[PDB]
């Protein structure tokens, strides 16, 4: 219709049938993942520049669900999709096996142990 947002956790941001929350607590990747899991969700997965255009406006750097598992050789999303080289601009600021989201659809490569704010997402 015009209205009503698509079933989300309470007190979460709802946009284009997708649920987000930004978290102030500095956590490493694993703790961040665990948190999102706890709430039947997952770290931010980027899939569409049109559907997730609001990510253009969020400022600081945050954990998203993009990881290198040193076994598989390639980078991957939490759910097990590959990263399309089209989706994000990847920068190597530090060296690690996890990635922070910034800016406009950037991915900053970060040591998974270093604590940062995080973004969870649920569909």
């Amino acid at each position, epitope marked *: 219709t015009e209205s009503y947002c698509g079933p989300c956790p309470k007190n979460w941001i709802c946009y284009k049938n997708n649920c987000y929350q930004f978290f102030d607590e500095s956590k490493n990747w694993y703790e961040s993942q665990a948190s999102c899991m706890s709430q039947n969700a997952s770290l931010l997965k980027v899939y569409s520049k049109e559907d997730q255009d609001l990510l253009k406006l969020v400022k600081s750097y945050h954990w998203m669900g993009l990881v290198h598992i040193p076994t598989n050789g*390639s980078w991957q999303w939490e759910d097990g999709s590959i990263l399309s080289p089209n989706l994000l601009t990847i920068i190597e600021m530090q060296k690690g096996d996890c990635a922070l989201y910034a800016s406009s659809f950037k991915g900053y490569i970060e040591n998974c142990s270093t604590p940062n704010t995080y973004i969870c997402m649920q569909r």
Partner: antibody
Amino acid sequence: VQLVQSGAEVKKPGASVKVSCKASGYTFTSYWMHWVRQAPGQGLEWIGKIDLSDSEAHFNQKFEDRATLTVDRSTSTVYMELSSLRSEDTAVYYCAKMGEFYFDYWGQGTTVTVSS
Amino acid sequence: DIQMTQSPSSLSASVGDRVTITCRTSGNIYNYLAWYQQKPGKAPKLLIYNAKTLADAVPSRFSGSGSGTDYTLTISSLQPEDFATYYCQHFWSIPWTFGGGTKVEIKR
């Protein structure tokens, strides 16, 4: 399956060159158009990218100070403009549309010669 | 900012030979590797993407392997239409960079 670039350009050292590229695929959503050049007796170099939909752009540190990328919604045209030219800038300039896995389509190239 | 080293620069081979070109990168590029074949005066044609995947309408004589920092293009039985310059490129961190090229000529 081919992008259309402006014709060959000749410029003096110091001057600027503006090369165009017409997309034809563009349907008001994300379309990353990249820019790559190849000097005779070189491999290729990546200059920058721009998204037709939102005009967002990124450059190689090597060119960021001398290069601009502009876009036109209506004509689907991307303009790569490189300034403060030197003779090393003599090369063939290609635009390419980046698809989901690799570059979907390349332009036909534009020769740019830079000489006194 | 990652350097690609192709190897060798030039190769002179016969129709029917095995050929292997290598691309060695200065940093891990996580299998985001492409192989291109460029004939004179034309834009590069893509053969192999993500290190090992064969592109559409590419003959299966073309095969890519490697991982990490070491990657390999193999042509099992070099054919007349395969004499060309070959390039590798990464599709990982900005800026994407290309190799110096391997120019493959006919022995006679």
